[model samples]
Target: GSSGSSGANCFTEELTNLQVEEKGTAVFTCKTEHPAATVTWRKGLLELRASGKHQPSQEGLTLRLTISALEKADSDTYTCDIGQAQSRAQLLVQGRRSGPSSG
Candidate 1:
């Protein structure tokens, strides 16, 4: 007789598309089975970094990214990659309306 443990290693939660206002913040969250899994955030073809505008953090099985002062150029498809598995989400940034125009 033999015993074996079986479980799937995958992302339990995927990133959802977001619509945010200009100057607002956009957050993307996801969960993975492996706590030690390497997670990378990317905007299109470029990898994201934790600088003044972009913030990336993770704890246990959850990974989070916060983008502050959202701009039109920041609106794009973002991807969260953990090992070979990945999830994607689109971010749409809406501009604020101008006040009443003078006649």
Candidate 2:
């Protein structure tokens, strides 16, 4: 009497590309349709850990990666993975522009 497929696990929200100023912050967000799915964040091929400027948090099906006081080295391709579904975002770090002062 019931007809339902078990392929409902999917990424509801994907990561978006971000351009942030140096010494600023960047946040990458991801959401999944399955709350029980395990989510992880990584920079390139390495897995990310919470230390110093890098912080990762999750709520229900939503996951967030917060980078504070971003440095030039922090700019890279970040990935969020949930099971077999993954999303990636490119982070670009731009230096602050200085203008000439009026006399």
Candidate 3:
């Protein structure tokens, strides 16, 4: 006897929104219930190709998206999709101001 069906949500755990200083690194992680699932990471409207500063790595069911040298323009909502499930988080990149607000 079984309660009901499962696997409705493929993502078991997902990363949360983060705030970091400029030039710092940010890492986003997520896990999938299915091992054979393929994950996709996106930044706003553009899909991450995992090139240069952006790196997307997957170890079995674990998925990771890492970005180095976080800049002001890098602040945006990131998405991790596993076809059946999706996760999203916003990255806030804070500028290292040297008392610039002296007004």
TM-score per prediction, in order, is 0.80, 0.77, 0.81
How would you order the candidates by lDDT, starting with the best?
1, 3, 2
Better of 2 and 3 by lDDT: 3
Flag the better candidate by lDDT, 1 or 3: 1
TM-score winner, 2 or 3: 3
User: What does candidate 3's lDDT look like per residue over 2-103, in tens digits?
Assistant: 787545547778788899988998989778877634667888878888687788887988888888999999999888877777889899899877575768
Local distance difference test values of all predictions, in order: 0.82, 0.80, 0.81
Q: Which 10 residues in a row give candidate 2 its minimum summed lDDT?
A: 1-10
Clashes per candidate (backbone, < 3 Å): 0, 0, 0
Worst 10 residues of 1 by lDDT: 1-10
Arranged by TM-score, best first: 3, 1, 2
- How many Å off is the CA of 103 in candidate 3? 5.6
- What ranges in model 2 sit over 4 Å off? 1-8, 97-103
Checking candidate 2 for backbone clashes, the offending pairs are none
Q: Tell me the spans in candidate 3 whose CA falls farther than 4 Å from its real position.
A: 1-9, 101-103
